[PDB]
Design a protein around this ligand. Structure first.
Ligand code: ADP
Ligand code: MG
Ligand code: ZN
Ligand code: ZN
Lengths: 92, 74, 213
């Protein structure tokens, strides 16, 4: 709830954006599972933000990536299958 | 939920599984289990999930997991 | 905080159960003996439950390590008693399961009876317990669940039942006891041989030892 997030998609990938402003890259811990995304962001003054949804579709962890930018964090999930996800999170 | 570590081993508590799993490895058809509940009624023993009801208790114990879902650490 | 609220609670049966009871009590049936099978089934079911629970927690059996069913006729009081060491019932279980909630099979069983079905089907419609009123004018149930204290439920099927904390009775340990007060023309169910044949007729292959006393 500390930061909001959005996604868009292409036939072969889902791009998740977390709108978190001035975050140093070392404070960003992101990991990928077969069908889960893990995003944990440390905030020295406060509690850590986390976004860890089970995903609508399966992904390929080895091909996933992210970039920590000045204004946001962009995460690219490689779809395991060529289908349109009806949402980001499983069962939604 | 509270924060988790997708690399941390857990014990699945789904009926008929009880396996150790990581979650980084979890997915929607990973776990074979009876969602349950068990049913003991009018002298029949069985599982409401697959609707199989059997007669002997020991026989009931052998009814195979009927569903593929997510492993669940709780 | 009212530090003494353990009285006797009185409850009205649900309308549909009052109807069921009246149907059971006011019509003639030639096979009333099926009541015993229904009570044995309920005991068997309750023993299954605590057995199952015990597979993942052996301490579940502590208050009574043996799984059994005892049948005790008494000519002096005209009562037929059935005792089991099943899972027993919480006070809430008594109120919820034995009078205050009309389960879906209730109205269904009544319709099935009016269409021509035999009263023997009562177990399949989720209301087998009330078949005790085929032969008894009064039933008292004492019961002990691991989670609660011992309670006694009682009814003469006159529209209501009571539930009372039982601090003075024998003390079951775990399980339930049903005492049936037989009607005048139903004394045959106190005879050892009648019970024996009946257990053999309708039960016979139950998975827990039944003894007669
Ligand atoms: N001997 C017993 N021990 C524990 N619970 C019982 C016993 N007899 C009856 N009950 C409870 O009362 C409920 C109603 O019993 P019954 O009218 O025979 O319907 P059913 O067995 O189809 O549920 C049971 O489901 C059970 O929860
Ligand atoms: Mg029954
Ligand atoms: Zn099943
Ligand atoms: Zn599992």
């Amino acid at each position: 709830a500390k930061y909001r997030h959005e996604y868009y998609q292409k036939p072969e990938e889902v791009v998740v954006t977390v709108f978190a402003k001035g975050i140093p890259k070392q404070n960003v811990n992101i990991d990928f599972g077969e069908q889960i995304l893990s995003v944990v962001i440390e905030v020295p003054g406060e509690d850590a933000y986390y976004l860890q949804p089970r995903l609508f579709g399966k992904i390929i962890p080895d091909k996933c990536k992210y970039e920590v930018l000045s204004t946001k964090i962009e995460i690219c999930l490689a779809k395991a299958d060529i289908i349109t996800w009806a949402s980001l999170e499983h069962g939604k | 939920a509270a924060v988790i570590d997708i690399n941390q081993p857990q014990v699945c508590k789904n009926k008929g599984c009880g396996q150790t799993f990581k979650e980084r490895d979890n997915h929607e058809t990973a776990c074979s289990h009876h969602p349950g509940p068990a049913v003991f009624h009018d002298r029949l023993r069985g599982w409401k999930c697959c609707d199989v009801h059997v007669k002997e208790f020991d026989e009931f114990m052998e009814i195979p997991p009927c569903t593929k879902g997510w492993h669940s650490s709780s | 905080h009212h530090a003494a609220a353990t009285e006797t609670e009185t409850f009205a049966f649900q309308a549909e159960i009052n109807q069921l009871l009246s149907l059971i009590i006011n019509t003639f049936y030639s096979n009333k003996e099926i009541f015993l099978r229904e009570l044995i089934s309920n005991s068997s079911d309750a023993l299954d439950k605590i057995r199952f629970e015990s597979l993942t927690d052996k301490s579940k059996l502590d208050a009574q390590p043996e799984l059994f069913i005892h049948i005790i006729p008494d000519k002096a009081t005209s009562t037929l008693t059935i005792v089991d060491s099943g899972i027993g019932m919480t006070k809430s279980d008594l109120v919820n399961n034995l009078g205050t909630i009309a389960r879906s099979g209730t109205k269904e069983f009544m319709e099935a009876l009016a269409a021509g079905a035999d009263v023997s089907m009562i177990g399949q419609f989720g209301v087998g317990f009330y078949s005790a009123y085929l032969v008894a004018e009064r039933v008292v149930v004492t019961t002990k669940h691991n989670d609660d204290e011992q309670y006694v439920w009682e009814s003469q099927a006159g529209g209501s039942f009571t539930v009372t904390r039982d601090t003075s009775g024998e003390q079951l340990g775990r399980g339930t006891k049903m005492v049936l007060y037989l009607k005048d023309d139903q004394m045959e169910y106190l005879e050892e041989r009648r019970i024996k044949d009946l257990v053999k007729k309708h039960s016979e292959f139950i998975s827990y030892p039944i003894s007669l006393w």
